[PDB]
């Protein structure tokens, strides 16, 4: 009977991710005023979250619940490619925003000139194309397949992610580690700018910045690091990891996409659009 | 027929292409508005930030205007000849109460003459200059209603020049200038526009302050109660005028900060006619305008 | 001076009953009511826009 209870919670998570990203995507397209240079990027995050919540999680929920992959061998490999592209796109997009906010604050008087509608599409397309070198290329060359559970790749009943030592390190570095270093570095410099500006205000007059800056970095770090710290150590030390442990951290990471719109919201423009939508 | 509709598309493409090129230029350029009274000497800042015979003729006429006004406000043939030329060419103590050009006294007593005395213009004077940053364009209104202010909503900052020394010119002029500052601050349309104000004639401020003939306490009773702030004050100046210097700033500052929080800041700068660094001061303050505007965006502040 | 002169001409202005003005104002609107697409939207084929 415990299996029935777990299904309700998993079903709600899939529903929550679908509605949350849809509203953000709908608001940007429906209203021209909300559509801006910075808001063009969040459409990509909304698009990345939308496909992840509908074409990755729902199939993954069936895999755990039914304890078997009813679909064909090729489609399971296809699902893995879609599963990794969405995570790579979502994490990279958050890193792109970190670059966007860093340029606006640290180097003003050039943000209007550097960023443009034509320029916004180029970098967004580059981010998505970057996922192609991380998702499409492995399956085409079948390099994702591992010798433990060698028959798992062959058998169509159940398939598990068994990756070579090279890909596990390289993909984790590209998807999460490299965006992490960029995101932390620019946000630290942004915090210095806020501290300097606040100090200047107190100089000629008679912090809350950390609280709001913590949410953006904290949610990204809390919801992905436990998985990616384990996504690099299971391959080097096979005996250390447990099979159920790996899955539990993976689904924690999927919740970040569902909670992503909440972090990047509460602005006056989106609050108006929420009332207009409902 | 259908070719004309296709032809109209080609003409539309040229217009869209031409507008697209100017979109980057317009976005790069920054707009400022200069506000100041007649005696505020706003022309000095514009000239400092950025012929002689023509200026001399107006200056000579300006001397006659003060001379004629002084007689009416209180060698008659000589006075009549000037009021009505080499013959015409051949007061200041009471000039505070009367209305006169600031540089008229220097001209009357008598190469930086153009900077000291400049002919004003009724029309809007647009000043464009570059400080190695994005393009800067300064606009001057050039009336009691002041309805053109509501038209200005895209300017990054507003320059509000104040003649600090002109506190004894009761018609007090400074309180009148302060009164206009409250109206622009409490304007229902100037929500996201800051102000950069210059307390001009600081050197002239000390001279009036140093001399005990005019007491700031007479115009402002609270000045005696007001004490100098503990914050650092540049000196080279006596503390007697230094306390006076901060009081006029505090009066402007108290109204500016109390009314609104966020996207409404004032950047008081003490300035002098000789000083030419004011161009860099605006750029340093203009940079703070965009940052604080962006800090409030995304609720990062 | 001029305002008194300007207001002097205001005294010698013929006036009409408000009821007469209201009836004329209402009658004109009734006459032109049919020929107004804002009151009744034009047919899609008839409307040049769509």
């Amino acid at each position: 009977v415990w299996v029935v209870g777990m299904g309700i919670v998993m079903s709600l998570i899939v529903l929550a991710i679908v509605f949350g990203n849809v509203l953000v995507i709908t608001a940007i397209a429906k209203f021209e005023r909300l559509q801006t240079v910075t808001n063009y990027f969040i459409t990509s995050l909304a698009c990345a979250d939308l496909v992840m919540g509908l074409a990755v999680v729902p199939f993954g929920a069936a895999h755990i619940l039914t304890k078997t992959w009813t679909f064909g061998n090729f489609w399971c490999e296809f699902w893995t490619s879609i599963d990794v592209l969405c995570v790579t796109a979502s994490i990279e997009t958050l890193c792109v925003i970190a670059v966007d906010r860093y340029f606006a604050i640290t180097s003003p008087f050039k943000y209007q000139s550097l960023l443009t509608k034509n320029k916004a599409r180029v970098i967004i397309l580059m981010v998505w194309i970057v996922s192609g070198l991380t998702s499409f290329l492995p399956i085409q060359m079948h390099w994702y397949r591992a010798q433990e559970a060698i028959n798992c790749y062959a058998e169509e009943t159940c398939c598990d992610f068994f990756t070579n030592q090279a890909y596990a390190i390289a993909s984790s570095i590209v998807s999460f580690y490299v965006p992490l270093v960029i995101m932390v570095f620019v946000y630290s410099r942004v915090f210095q700018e806020a501290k300097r500006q606040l100090q200047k205000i107190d100089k000629s007059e008679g912090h809350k910045a950390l609280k709001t800056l913590g949410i953006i970095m904290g949610t990204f770090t809390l919801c992905w690091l436990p998985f990616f710290i384990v996504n690099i150590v299971h391959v080097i030390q096979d005996n250390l990891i447990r099979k159920e442990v790996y899955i539990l951290l993976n689904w924690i990471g999927y919740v970040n996409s569902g909670f992503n719109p909440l972090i990047y919201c509460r602005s006056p423009d989106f609050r108006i659009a929420f009332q207009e939508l409902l | 027929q259908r070719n004309e509709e296709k032809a109209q598309r080609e003409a539309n493409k040229k217009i869209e292409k031409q507008l697209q090129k100017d979109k980057q230029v317009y976005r790069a350029t920054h707009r400022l508005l200069l506000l100041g009274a007649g005696e505020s000497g706003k022309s000095t800042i514009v000239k400092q930030m950025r012929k002689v015979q023509d200026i001399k003729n107006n200056l000579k006429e300006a001397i006659e205007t003060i001379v004629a006004a002084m007689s009416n406000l209180v060698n008659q043939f000589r006075v009549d000849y000037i009021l009505s030329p080499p013959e015409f060419y051949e007061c200041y103590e009471r000039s505070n109460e009367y209305q006169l050009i600031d540089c008229a006294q220097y001209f009357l007593d008598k190469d930086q003459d153009l900077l000291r005395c400049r002919v004003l213009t009724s029309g809007i004077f647009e000043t464009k200059f570059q400080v190695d940053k994005v393009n800067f364009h300064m606009f001057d209104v050039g009336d009691e209603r002041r309805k053109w202010i509501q038209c200005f909503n895209d300017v990054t900052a507003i320059i509000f020049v104040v003649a600090s020394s002109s506190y004894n010119m009761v018609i007090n002029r400074l309180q009148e200038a302060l009164n206009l500052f409250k109206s622009i601050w409490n304007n229902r349309w100037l929500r996201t526009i800051s102000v950069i104000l210059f307390l001009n004639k600081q050197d002239l401020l000390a001279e009036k302050v140093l001399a005990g003939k005019s007491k700031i306490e007479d115009y402002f009773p609270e000045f005696a109660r007001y004490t100098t702030p503990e914050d650092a004050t540049p000196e080279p100046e006596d503390p007697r005028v230094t306390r006076a210097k901060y009081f006029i700033r505090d009066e402007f500052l108290r109204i500016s900060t109390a009314s609104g929080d966020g996207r409404h800041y004032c950047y008081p700068h003490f300035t002098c006619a000789v000083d030419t660094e004011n161009i860099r001061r605006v750029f340093n303050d203009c940079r703070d305008i965009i940052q604080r505007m962006h800090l409030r965006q995304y609720e990062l502040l | 001076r001029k305002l008194v002169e300007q207001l002097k001409m205001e005294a010698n202005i013929d006036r009409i009953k408000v009821s007469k003005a209201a009836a004329d104002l209402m009658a004109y609107c009734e006459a032109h009511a049919k020929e107004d697409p804002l009151l009744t939207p034009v047919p899609a084929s008839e409307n040049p826009f769509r």
Binding site: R33 | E16, L19, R145 | L39
Partner: protein, 331 residues
């Protein structure tokens, strides 16, 4: 001295009260209501740089011109949605635009006291420059090709002759800075509104105001003639917009809403005059019944505040401006 004028002013008000017998709403009570109007946005003409300030329909209703603080005055085609000509402006700020009845010339305003008459007919060049006002130019209109009527912030309205280049007649004696003017269909008279809450009409040939209306309490910013030519409506900064009939010398019906407390920027009648399309500072445009003095439909399709509103000579469609550079054409 001033006592006689004050006594005369009180006597003038007494005549207006005596001239009133029945309320306008009393007569229009039996009139069937127009009902709710489902009003849509047939076109969304966009593609401009900055906030626009004024818009005027062409005589043939095919074209219209919009002027903006960006200094780019572009003439737009409504049906094909594509711009025809873009006229660069010597002055960065403009506060008015006007279209010739013949369509040959297009008049652009300006914060500087200049009213440039651009030549549409293939390089746009200024035909003449009209100047000579202390204040800013706020409105411009074309009685004909020869005559251009302009409003200034110097509390004076003047008529410009293109060939002479000088003010043929100057209309003075008005308190506040004049904001908006409208021209009657017969072109015999026109009106003018200032911040002094006073609305006056003038005779072009005579040059002296015929009637003075001072019903409003706040500054007024919009005014337009009824199609019949015997009445006009005024839009003030106060929430109320009143309708005046020149014959009755008094306000007939006041259009005010308790909930609405924002300002009003532009007003415009329909072709039949039943619908009074008025912009607002609340980011919405309201269309109210002229006779019943009751709201008929609410339209809030804009993001920034509406700055202009005009109706075609054919009456087919209405265009409202905005500070978001969005010319939303409603049909």
């Amino acid at each position: 001295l001033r006592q006689e004028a004050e006594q005369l002013k009180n006597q003038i008000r007494d005549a207006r009260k005596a001239c009133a017998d029945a309320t306008l709403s009393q007569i229009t009570n039996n009139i069937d209501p127009v009902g709710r109007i489902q009003m849509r946005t047939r076109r969304t003409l966009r593609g401009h740089l900055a906030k626009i300030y004024a818009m005027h329909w062409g005589t043939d209703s095919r074209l219209l011109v919009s002027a903006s603080q960006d200094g780019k005055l572009i003439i737009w085609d409504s049906y094909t949605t594509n711009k025809v000509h873009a006229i660069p402006l010597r002055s960065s700020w403009v506060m008015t635009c006007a279209y010739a009845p013949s369509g040959n010339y297009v008049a652009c305003g300006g914060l500087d006291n200049i009213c440039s008459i651009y030549n549409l007919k293939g390089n746009v060049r200024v035909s003449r420059e009209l100047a000579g006002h202390t204040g800013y130019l706020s409105c411009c209109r074309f009685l004909d090709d020869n005559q251009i009527v302009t409003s200034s912030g110097d509390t004076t309205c003047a008529l410009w002759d293109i060939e002479t280049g000088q003010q043929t007649t100057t209309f003075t004696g008005h308190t506040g800075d004049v904001m908006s003017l409208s021209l009657a269909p017969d072109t015999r008279l026109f009106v003018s509104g200032a911040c002094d809450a006073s609305a006056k009409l003038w005779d072009v040939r005579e040059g002296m105001c015929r009637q003075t209306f001072t019903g409003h309490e706040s500054d007024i910013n919009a005014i337009c003639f009824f199609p019949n030519g015997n009445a006009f409506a005024t839009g003030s900064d106060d929430a109320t917009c009143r309708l005046f009939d020149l014959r009755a010398d008094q306000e007939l019906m006041t259009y005010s809403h308790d909930n609405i407390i924002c300002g009003i920027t532009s007003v415009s009648f329909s072709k039949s005059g039943r619908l009074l399309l008025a912009g607002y500072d609340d980011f919405n445009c309201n269309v109210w019944d002229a006779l019943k003095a009751d709201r008929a439909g609410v339209l809030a399709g804009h993001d920034n505040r509406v700055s202009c509103l005009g109706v075609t000579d054919d009456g087919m469609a209405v265009a409202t401006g905005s500070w978001d550079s969005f010319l939303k054409i409603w049909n």
